[PDB]
Design a protein around this ligand. Structure first.
Ligand SMILES: COc1cc(C(F)(F)F)ccc1Cn1ncc2c(Cl)nc(N)nc21
Length: 223
């Protein structure tokens, strides 16, 4: 087995409170309405984000003239705790991205996204992934979401990011955060299936060969 996910991060800073941007809640809701019928697709959306983060790290390291480190995507199910967890060893998120990225689209304009979603030229899941709101799909299956991230940028601190998706999110400095990003999803009552290894394996194996970095599920290689 090869696992990197462990509950070892520790809160080491006081909590700063932030309220959702105006049109953030509306986008959360529309992503949920759009993907309910195939709600298992949140896993693919998050794997895609992880893959993107690893590509961003690659380009940083190429310009830095440095070797590629362990570049991996990990899934972990906990049936007892009713969670699914995804962790990647990519570029991570800065403090300002953790504070601002949730409301990025709406502020920058959601019209292009909403128009594309309406046209249905591609799968709704692809449109959502492409316009950079795949993280929104975490909330549609979650009672609450727990993020740990630390950017590869020099001087970046590690952070814990918490939200129930209701209108507020909380950020605190954390120790023991590995460069990259871990998302812990505490699953909704109708979404418990995704805390089952068998179920998640059945979902992921349908596209795991399309993932360009080593993909692990509960310590087992999927590709
Ligand atoms: C936790 O991923 C996110 C959190 C938030 C926020 F709301 F917590 F800020 C907004 C957007 C995203 C998606 N996202 N953005 C950068 C990024 C990187 Cl570097 N890695 C991964 N795996 N996902 C990413």
């Amino acid at each position: 087995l090869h696992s990197i996910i462990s509950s070892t991060e520790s809160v080491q800073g006081s909590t700063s409170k932030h309220e959702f941007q105006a049109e953030t809640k509306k986008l959360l809701d529309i992503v949920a309405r759009s993907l309910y019928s195939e709600k298992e697709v949140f896993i693919r959306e998050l794997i895609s984000n992880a893959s993107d983060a690893l590509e961003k790290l690659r380009h940083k390291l190429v310009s830095d003239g440095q070797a590629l480190p362990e570049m991996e995507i990990h899934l972990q199910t906990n049936a007892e705790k009713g969670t699914i967890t995804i962790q990647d060893t990519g570029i991570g998120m800065t403090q300002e991205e953790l504070v601002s990225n949730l409301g990025t689209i709406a502020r920058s304009g959601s019209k292009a996204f909403l128009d594309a979603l309406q046209n249905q030229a591609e799968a709704s899941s692809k449109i959502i992934g492409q316009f950079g709101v795949g993280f929104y799909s975490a909330f549609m299956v979650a009672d609450r979401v727990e993020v740990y991230s630390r950017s590869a940028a020099p001087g970046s601190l590690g952070y814990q990011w918490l939200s129930d998706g209701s209108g507020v999110f909380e950020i605190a400095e954390a120790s023991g955060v590995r460069t990259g990003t871990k998302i812990i999803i505490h699953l909704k009552s109708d979404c418990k299936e995704f805390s089952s290894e068998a179920r998640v394996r059945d979902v992921v194996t349908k596209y795991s060969n399309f993932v360009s970095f080593p993909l692990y599920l509960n310590g087992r290689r999927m590709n």
